[PDB]
Structure formats: C-alpha cells, structure tokens
Design a protein around this ligand. Structure first.
Ligand code: MN
Ligand code: MN
Ligand code: MN
Ligand code: MN
Ligand code: MN
Ligand code: MN
Ligand code: MN
Ligand code: MN
Ligand code: MN
Ligand code: MN
Ligand code: MN
Ligand code: MN
Lengths: 190, 190, 190, 190, 190, 190
C-alpha cells in the first residue's frame, strides 16, 4: 500500500532503499558499516517496517559519506511512502530505556523539516564504536537524524535524558525514533 | 452522547459554548480575538471535539476579560460533558513538537482542580502577538489553562521543554492540552 | 455633604471631575483610554464614591497627558471634598488579593503629600495593556498614584507583595488605594 | 439565615459538616485526628461560626485522606452558606501574632478559586506534630488551605512572616484564615 | 470603667501613671525627656486613652532609667486596666505611614508576654535625637516596647517596613502600637 | 492465561502472592503495613491486574523486611506470569499527575534487570508517613522498585519531575509504574 523504492547514485556512494510502512519487521541492511547496519536493523525492526538497504561507499576514506547518503535516501523513501499523509495519527513519541540510558523521540509527520537533538554527553563527540571493520563515530548520530528529518520533511526531536555507555545511548536513540515513527504512521480511527 | 451547552452572561462578556466530546473536529470559534480564535480552533480540532464558541466582550478595554470568561465557560462545558467520568481512560499525555518548540501536557480527569504551568521563557511575560485586530498577550496562557482546569475540576500539567518563537510556544501548549484531553476521554476497553 | 466639582483646562487636555465622598458606587468615567476608564471605575466603586469623569485629551500622541491630568484633577477634587478633615478616621489600609497577585495600600489623610510605590516587577516598566483603542502603559501607575497623592496632599504607600499578570497587578493596586481611601474617610466614633 | 449541611461519602472517608456563618463560636469537631480537631476548633471559634464536624476515615493508613476530605467538605459547606454573596464586605485580612510567630491571611470571597501559601520554613515539610494518637504532618497545611479555597471558590492568601515553632505556625495560620473569613462575611453598611 | 493608677518608687526614678482605656485623647505627659514626652503623647492620643504621666528620674546620668521605668509602669497600668479581658476584640493591627516611613504593629492581648521588634535600620542603634534638653537614643525603642509587652503581659510585634529619618521611624512605631492597642481593646459585638 | 502463585518463606517474613496479568482490578492486599497496602492496592488497580497479597512479618522491628520481601515475591510472580514475553508490546511509559506532583515511569520487559530512580526531593530520605499503625519510611521506595525490577528481570525507570507532598510523590510513583506495566504487557497487534 505505502511502499517506496529509492536509488541514489553519487560520486561518494551508491544506495538502494526499499521500504514498506505496513510491514512486520522484515529487515535486511548491508552498508559496509557493521554498527550502522545494527542500528538500521533496530530502526527497521522496532518501527515494524519492511526495510531492505544495499549501500556501497568509500569506506576506505571513512563511513561518514556512506552513512550520510544512506540516511538521506532512507529519509526520501520514508517521505515518499507517507504520500499525502492522509488519515494517520501524525503524532508519535516513545521513551526507550536501555539499562542506565533513557532516550526519548517525538515526531510530527505533517510538520516542516526540523530536527532538535539534545542531551547527549559531551564525551560522545569524540567516541568511537569499533569492532573488526569500519568504525562508527558517535558524532554522526546528529547528522543521521538531521538528514532523515530534512529529507522526510518531518519534525524530529530526539532527547537523551541520561546515559553513560555510547552503544546504549546510540541504540536507544535509534529505537526511540523507530517507535515514534511507528506510532505516527498508524491510521487514526477518528 | 456526551454533550454540553453553556451560556454565561456577565457584565464584562457574554459567552455561548456548545461542546460534544465524541466529535470529528467540527469547530467554529468567534470571540473577537483572532489569535485566541486560532488557538481555540486548534484546541477543538486536535482533541476531535465538536466546538462552537460565540463570545462578545469588551475588546476595547483589552482581551483579558473575554479570554478569561471564555476559558471558564469552556471548562464548565467540558466538566459537564464528562458527566460521571465512568469507564474512560482518565489519564492522557502528549508531546507536541512545533519546529524548535517541544511542549508537553498531562491530564488526570478524576483528579481535583489543579494546574501546574512550567518552562515558558521569561520573555513570554511581556510578549504580544499582534495582527490587524485585538492583540494577544502571552502572559494570559497560564490564566487560560488555570481557568479551564479549575472549572473542569481536572488536573492539568503543561510544560514547555524548550522553544523560542512565542507563536509556536503558545500553539504547541494548546495542541498538547487538546491531545492529552482527547486521549483521556476515550473509553477504556478494560 | 462632602462634594467637589473640578474643571481643569490645559493645552493638552480638558477634564471635568465630580466627586462625592459619601456615595454608593455610582460611577461614570470616560477619558478616551478604555483601560484607564476600567481602573477609575474600580477606584470609584470600591471606595463607595460617586464619581463622574469626563476627559478629552490628545490621545493621538499618547494617553500619558490625559491620564496625568485626570489624576491631578481627581486628586484636587478629593482634597477639596475632604475639606478640613475633621472627625474622620484619617488612617486606612487594605490588602487586595487578585488571583496570584497581592497588593497593599496604606493612607494617611492628614499627612503631607508623599508617595512610596514599591514591589512591582521590573517587566512592568515596558509592559503595555492594549485592546482595540489607545493602549495603557503600566509604567504610568507610579505617575498616577504620585499625582493623586501630591494633589490630594495625602500620604499614599502602595506595595505589590507578589504578582505576575500586569492587568491583575494594576487592578489590585487601584482597588487597594480605593479601599484604603474608603476606610480613611469614614467618621471616627470617638 | 446562612446555614449549610454537607454530607460527603467516599471510599476513603465519611464526613458530615454543619455550618452557620452567623454564629457565636459553638464548635464541636471530631475527625479522629486530635491536632486537626484542635485546629478546626480554632478555625470555627475565631471566625464566630457554628461548626459541627463528624468525620470517620482510614486513620490506620494515615490522616491525609480524612484531613483532605474534611477540608473539601468544609469548603463546600462554606461556599453554599455564602449563597449569592450579596451585601457582604467581601474583603478581609488578619494578622495573628502567636509568640514568636506572625501569620497573615487575606481573602476575597467573590474572587475565583485561588490559593497562595508562602513563608513557611523549609523544615515544616518534614515536621510531625505527634501526641498519643494519629499524628499530624505539617506538609498538609498547604493542602488544607488549597482544598478549602478550591471548594469554597474564594481567593485565599496565607503568609507566615516569621516563626519557629511548628505548632505556633500552624495554629496562627488557621486563626488568620478564620479571622479573615469572619471579617469578609460581615454585611456591608453601604 | 477600665481605669488604673500605678505608683512605682525605685532608687533610680519615681513614676506616677493614670490610665483610662475608654478615653478621648486627654493626655498629659511629663518625664524630663522631651522627645519621650512627645512619643508618649502620640501613644496616648492615637490610642484614644486618657493618660497622665508624672516621672522624676536621674536625667543627669541619662534618660535610660527613667524611660525604662516609665515604660514598665505604663505596661503595668495597661495590664491592670484591661482586667479580665472579657468581651474585647483582643486582636489589633495598624499600618502607620509617616512620609517615607511605613511601620506596622500587631497585638494579641490575651497572648503571653512576647515582643518581636524587626526592620529598623542598623544606623538607629547609634542615632541620637537631641534638642535643648536630655537627648533620646533610638536604641531604647526596643527596650520600651519589650518592657511594655512584658509588664502588660501581651504579644507585641512591631515592624518597620522601610524608612530613613529616625524621628519618623520612632514616631511611626509609637503610633502603630497606639492604634493596634486601640483596636484590640474595643468591645466585640459578637 | 498468564497467572502466577508465589509462596516465599524466610526467617523475617512469610509471603503469599497471587497474580493474574489479564485481570480487571480485583485487588486484596494485607501486609501489616497500612500505607504499603494502600500503595500495592493502587499498583494492582491501576495496572488492571488481579492481585492477592498475604504477608506476615516482624513489624515489631520495622516494616523494612516485610516490604522488601513482599516486593521481591511480587517481582518474582510478575516475571513468572510474563513467561516467555512473546507477542507483547514490551515497552510502556506513563505520566501520572497527582495535584502538584508529576511522576513518570518507563519499562522495558525484555530488557535486563535495571532500575534507575531519580528526581525525588532530598527531604524524602528522612520522611515518615505515619497513621495508627506501623509507619512507612519513604526512603524505602527506591528499595521497592529496585527489588521488583531485579526479581522481574525488567528495566524500570522512575522519575519524579516535581512534587512537594510525600504521600502524593509516593502514590504517583506507584501509579506510574502500574500504568507503564499495564501498557507493556498488552498484546501487540503487529
Ligand atoms: Mn556530512
Ligand atoms: Mn547493540
Ligand atoms: Mn483575570
Ligand atoms: Mn498558528
Ligand atoms: Mn508626566
Ligand atoms: Mn479588569
Ligand atoms: Mn491529597
Ligand atoms: Mn495549640
Ligand atoms: Mn535597661
Ligand atoms: Mn514628632
Ligand atoms: Mn533492605
Ligand atoms: Mn493515598
């Protein structure tokens, strides 16, 4: 019903997005950045979407360009899948507790592209989440949410109430956005 | 089912209110204060009420008296339309993002008349929203919410988390109250 | 018994005042400044005077001159109506609660022209109460009380204990002065 | 002439109130909370009312519910006994010195339900007045005055200027409210 | 009806006091301290007493002893003239504006001997009011009020809200006490 | 469907718990601590559970041990009644306004045992809620929530935004937890 397929070819990266809003959590994400894949899987699963992401980018330089472009394309796909935004709840928020972390996101679908991101500890501006592959810098979370809000043309407010672990803080923010989106896109029985 | 018609004649103003809780957003407000009309239209529409307001007051002096009396009558009408408050959710809250502003309202219908209003910037105590007609002073928002809570005999907590524009701050507060009321008045399937 | 009719013609404004101290609250005020009319009606009614005010002034410039001249003439009329001030209580004070505002005024009729005005919030020096007509600037309240005390040759002390709304603060100050005057002008049964 | 009988049955407590405004200090209070009985006796006696209070509540849990419900019913009874509030002074205040304590209360009967309570020392938020029976927590004084003002639909301002002993502070507040009410309900010879 | 004659002979001074509570302001005071005579005349006149004071003391040393003893005897006389304190208002307060000064006194006749004196500027602890005779030190005002309250066995609270001139501050305090006493000693028509 | 019966015998206390998640608010609690009974009744009723609690403990020493053990057993029962936690919403939050108090609780059922408790005033660490029986010390609220979260193996975040009365603060916290649990245990229609 509300589906979107977006292909975005640039110099930096080549992205393909497939999104269905009325899904069941069938998610398959591959971007070359493992932690970003983990986060997008959470975003897709907790929002009850159907999400397929195939991204190829210059991960030798760093993940910034791929992550940015993927977020832009995902935002575009979401905005297109919303369509006219007729007969939906249009307002959603969610608190996500993750151990010692509490995050909150509030969305307004009909509202104009705006993004406020507050509350993250100052040490998250130089934190890196690294494994066996391309690392993820937590200074990019604001960039990701801003890109998604700007390209979906929605109002997104993400707050971290408190939290210590950077993994938990990031994951909670993504889940909060996912659940706010899920609530906002539901049909309104009024 | 849950309807209320309130007529309030005083020296200062003459108010007529018609309210149905189980409505579809059919709103018609005329008070002689255009911005207050805008705000009441938002309140009625976002709460999914049926709201007709006809108010005549001494707008040559200022809008204070008309706005106060309208809020009192609207609160009375809401309280009467609730009736015994049997088999309703009784608890509602809503976050309303409006660009850079985030507002929150939480209600308790069965709770005794109480109103807490916090978070508004200090510059909103002397701000005026003015057009081609009778202006609206933002120092009256607290008065309006207090009057409505005191005459509906409900607990109303309105918070502004952050925000800059006075128009956005006011409009977000009214929408937050509307959506909290809407959630609180729904029948409880338990 | 204790009546006064004062006509004051100046370049700026033309004022006529009729005052009876032993009245019943028969008040008719017209100055071209609606909020000032409201305040003078409160002053006359809460002091149980008979008060007729007809004022014509240069309201195109601003209300300052008309308000100042009216206050001077009213003070003159009050002072003349007191006469010799023989066999009256001579001391009066009143607390006036108005919602969140608490004001207090204390008078000494036999005392020499003095006016102390304290307690008003700093934001009242640039606040405007505006409707559909000539606006009222709250920085003029001190001017009004000083003019009345200086021309009635009485001691007037007006205090605002606490308060937020400028309308309430102003109205409470006028009512406090009215009730203090009312108590002070009563005959002393001793 | 101005009498009221209020019976309020709830889950928590069962209250009966009998009040006459034009009384002579005939007071009989029994609530199961001895100190609250002492305070209500002072309230009734110093206001020159006729007051009969019979209250049964869950004092095994704590006195909060009984005290709250009694205050609500007393406020209702007072409001009903006032009636139309025609030809009364409508404004009353009283200073009550009690040893080292000075309290003040100011009322406005015609004014809308409002309660401001200021000045109490911070140590009164965790103070207990205890004897041989159910204790009295002084954090409930604000609750009591708010309940009475909210249910009588009057403006009540209670201030503690200074004071040390919690018994004296509480007793002075109750006496100040009683004397302010007494002055406010008198007929106005004007 | 309520009269008192007190003779107090000590080493330091010899005092005679004649007081009638139901008087008309017939005052004759002679203590050898002119300013103290002025203050006692104000106290007697503004309280509508009949007051005769004849005091002889060691004014060569200083006025302290004479002033103290006179205040003690006056307090004793007042306490005796009150008698059983049956059927009187028992509570009185008064604000006294005197130019730039505002003083307040509140009394409780039935209350136990207590005196609180607050608000006087710090420069009044070393100020002298001097003329052609024995000077008056303003550090004695607290002593005088304490002596009167302690010997009348009443509760006396005297506050100076604001003020600059020591003459005005002292005179306002005495007048405030006088008017509070006057109000408190009146019969209660209830 | 989702029921649990837990019997916990220790040296300190003997507890029996019966819990059904799909209930209608049929609550019967008896622990020997009246205020704790009140709080557990609120917890059971506002969560729409069926809750039977029979607790016998050493209330002669203090309520700590009984309250702690009851909370542990209740947490165990809840955790067992959840079972595999399959097909439930798994995330719930609730704002509870109670007069001047605003509390918030957010839960994550699948999340690992964690408890964050913030926002309570510092005076609640030495406050006692006492009636005619064993008193309740408010320093135990954190203990109770921690015990329940630790034994239910859920993530519980309880915040007090603002509040003055200790009774209201405690009651609001319990109701917030109840409503968050209620929302979290509902089946997910996705
Ligand atoms: Mn970038
Ligand atoms: Mn993870
Ligand atoms: Mn108002
Ligand atoms: Mn707008
Ligand atoms: Mn001027
Ligand atoms: Mn007005
Ligand atoms: Mn309560
Ligand atoms: Mn006592
Ligand atoms: Mn001495
Ligand atoms: Mn003098
Ligand atoms: Mn323990
Ligand atoms: Mn309770």
């Amino acid at each position: 019903s509300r589906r979107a397929r977006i292909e975005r070819r640039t110099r930096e990266s080549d992205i393909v997005i497939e999104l269905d809003l009325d899904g069941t959590g069938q998610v398959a994400v591959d971007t070359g950045v493992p932690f970003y894949d983990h986060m997008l899987t959470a975003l897709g699963s907790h929002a009850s979407f159907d999400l397929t992401v195939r991204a190829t980018g210059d991960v030798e330089i760093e993940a910034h360009h791929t992550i940015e472009d993927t977020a832009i394309a995902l935002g575009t796909a979401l905005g297109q899948a919303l369509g006219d935004k007729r007969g939906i709840r249009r307002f959603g928020d969610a608190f996500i507790p993750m151990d010692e972390t509490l995050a909150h996101a509030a969305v307004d679908l009909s509202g104009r592209p705006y993004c406020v991101h507050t509350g993250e500890p100052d040490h998250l501006q130089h934190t890196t989440i690294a494994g066996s592959s391309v690392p993820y810098h937590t200074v990019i979370n604001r960039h990701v949410f801003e890109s998604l809000a700007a390209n979906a043309r929605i109002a997104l407010h993400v707050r971290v109430l408190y939290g210590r672990d950077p993994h938990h803080i990031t994951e909670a923010q993504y889940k909060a956005v996912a659940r706010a989106l899920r609530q906002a896109v539901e049909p309104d029985p009024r």
